[PDB]
């Protein structure tokens, strides 16, 4: 999970 987004 660490560091990971859904929307850029």
């Amino acid at each position, epitope marked *: *999970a*660490v*560091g*990971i*987004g*859904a*929307v*850029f």
Partner: antibody
Framework: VQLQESGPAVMKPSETLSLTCAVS?????????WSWIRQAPGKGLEWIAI????????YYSPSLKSRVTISKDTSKNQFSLKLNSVTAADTAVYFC????????????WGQGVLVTVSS | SVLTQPPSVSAAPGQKVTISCSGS????????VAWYQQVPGTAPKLLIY???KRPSGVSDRFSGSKSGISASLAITGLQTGDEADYYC???????????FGAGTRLTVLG
């Protein structure tokens, strides 16, 4: 995936801190995000930067962006951090971490290296 | 931190504890929330990912959810071994940065 940090235990103010994370059991240029994180003694976790293995895109803590470099090396299967102009405020345990971009139930952390900045 | 969580929470053994993290529509609103358990200065352990999923190996006394711009970790059947620091973590689309909450120190009363 396993991560191992390495870096200096002690540094003088104004120097450039340079850290490396050796990655094994996955490909540095696979579908991962590779982060650096730090924790000053007795304080909270602070994310510093990430580099994505597939694209090479990088993102940074707004408050640290002006002083930090994050890089990856495919031949070496590693990624690295540079933080310049350190002060005592940069004394912290520095962790390398990683996560698959899609399989986010997986979470990889190094055990952390203490970096002390002192004159 | 643009995410706010209480600095401390306390409850008696066996009770249900909730730790909440308040953010914005740009982080908690639209991105994956993760919850980490930590002893200070050592690697944190992922408890919840994708706001409400538990990884294999984590006790089912731990659960998570989010609603709007707020997210919550719930610990049922509190044990003294649950004393630790708890961090929410989430991407902020508008800052293009990953953000941890300031941390909540959990004390087990009695």
């Amino acid at each position: 995936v396993q991560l191992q940090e390495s870096g200096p235990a002690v540094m003088k103010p104004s120097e450039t801190l340079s850290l490396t994370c050796a990655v094994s059991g996955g490909s540095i240029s696979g579908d991962y995000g590779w982060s650096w994180i730090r924790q000053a003694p007795g304080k909270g976790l602070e994310w510093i930067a990430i580099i994505f293995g597939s694209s090479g895109s990088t993102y940074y803590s707004p408050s640290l962006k002006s002083r930090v470099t994050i890089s990856k090396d495919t031949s070496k299967n590693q990624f690295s951090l540079k933080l310049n102009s350190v002060t005592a405020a940069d004394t912290a345990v520095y962790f390398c971490a990683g996560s698959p971009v899609r399989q986010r139930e997986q979470d990889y952390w190094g055990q952390g290296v203490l970096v002390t900045v002192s004159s | 931190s643009v995410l706010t969580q209480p600095p401390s929470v306390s409850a008696a053994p066996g009770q249900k504890v909730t730790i909440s993290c308040s953010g914005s529509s740009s982080n908690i609103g639209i991105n994956y929330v993760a919850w980490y358990q930590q002893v200070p200065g050592t690697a944190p352990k992922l408890l919840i990912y994708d706001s409400n999923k538990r990884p294999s190996g984590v006790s089912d006394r731990f659960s998570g959810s989010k609603s709007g711009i707020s997210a919550s970790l719930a610990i049922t059947g509190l044990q003294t071994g649950d004393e630790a620091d708890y961090y929410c973590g989430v991407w902020d689309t508008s800052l293009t940065a990953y953000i941890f909450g300031a941390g909540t120190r959990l004390t087990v009363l009695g």
